[PDB]
Amino acid sequence: NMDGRIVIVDDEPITRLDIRDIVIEAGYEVVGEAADGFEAIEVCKKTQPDLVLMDIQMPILDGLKAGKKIVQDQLASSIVFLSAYSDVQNTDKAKKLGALGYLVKPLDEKSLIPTIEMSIERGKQTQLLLSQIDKLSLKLEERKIIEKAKGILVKENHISEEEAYQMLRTLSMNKRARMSEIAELIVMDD
Amino acid sequence: NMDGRIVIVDDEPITRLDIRDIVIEAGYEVVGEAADGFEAIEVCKKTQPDLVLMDIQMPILDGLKAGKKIVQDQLASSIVFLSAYSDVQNTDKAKKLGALGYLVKPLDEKSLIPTIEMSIERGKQTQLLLSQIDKLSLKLEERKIIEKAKGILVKENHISEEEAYQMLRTLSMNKRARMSEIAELIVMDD
Ligand SMILES: [Mg+2]
Ligand SMILES: [Mg+2]
Ligand code: NA
Ligand code: NA
Ligand code: NA
Ligand code: NA
Ligand code: NA
Ligand code: NA
Ligand code: NA
Ligand code: NA
Ligand code: NA
Ligand code: NA
Ligand code: NA
């Protein structure tokens, strides 16, 4: 039926069991549970879920701080908040840390399953886009630093740009360091 | 008092009015309204809203097709669906086309304002990511096509890489063309 790996985070045990029953009847896999933010971070690090269902308010460590950590280290693909609190200050924190949904307790159960589906898909889309950005940024910066190092090597040695690139390559091969690290060493403080 | 520009799309005038009253009381600007998918596409193209609230079940053209069009041509920053139906086929289509929220009628009003805040924030974030990807890709492709053109000129002319680049520069400036446009002509599926 519905596919996804879910972690449930709430300090009230019966509320966790009610949510658990709902998502298991939908066919999601509940890969872990937690009662405070420290447990939430721990469980998400181990399980690496598609989604965290979390109350913003919990003992010891609140859900917003736990969520900030979970997004920051990408321990789950998406976070959806479930809380009795819905003031603008709490929702501004939840949206700025990165949450994909926020339903207010008592839960409208019919909305929960659609919200989970949307949040899982959007979270994995976002992870893909951030990976694209990382790769593209790396390739562009490596081209830039290699170009700058080539210019420096030409000016210092009086070689051609082709010979400078072959210097960077042969150094990279023989050392077993990337040409961008070689180039950074050539460029430093210039 | 919230901030955001919203289009409300529902075939029922009373439901449009109920939602309008809620979001206006919250402080959002309703920039347009529609009763079918063709109207919704047109309104979004004129208004370019931060969010469109859309029913799936509509005559003439349904919400999923209109939403797919709105995402494809970036006519709104986010879509949230509002349907009496919550089945897996409708939710699969909504998530794949790229919706950020799906909520199920009759509306749990207390969730609506939080879901709007999340969806607007996530939509603006995603547009930033997509913009960064396009900028990085264009810069990288310009570098790549110039590199390819330089190597072609070197091999045909038997000039140095430096002289090849100055050829591309001189052509670009004399023709008042982008150097990538010149390089595209030099490469011409070589
Ligand atoms: Mg609590
Ligand atoms: Mg309808
Ligand atoms: Na289970
Ligand atoms: Na993750
Ligand atoms: Na904040
Ligand atoms: Na997304
Ligand atoms: Na990421
Ligand atoms: Na150079
Ligand atoms: Na409704
Ligand atoms: Na953002
Ligand atoms: Na592009
Ligand atoms: Na050059
Ligand atoms: Na340009």
Residue numbers in the entry:
A (entry chain B), B (entry chain A): 0 to 189
What do the authors of the reporting publication say about this deposited model?
ANTAR domains are a class of antiterminator that bind and stabilize dual hexaloop RNA motifs within the nascent RNA chain to prevent terminator loop formation. EutV possesses one of the most common domains architectures found among all ANTAR proteins annotated in the Pfam database, consisting of an N-terminal phosphor-sensitive REC domain (aa 1–119) coupled to a C-terminal ANTAR domain (aa 141–186) via a coiled-coil domain. Ethanolamine (EA) stimulates the histidine kinase EutW (component 1) to phosphorylate EutV (component 2) which promotes homodimerization of the protein. Dimeric EutV acts as an antiterminator of RNAP by binding these dual hexaloop motifs within the nascent mRNA chain inhibiting T-loop formation and thereby preventing transcription termination.
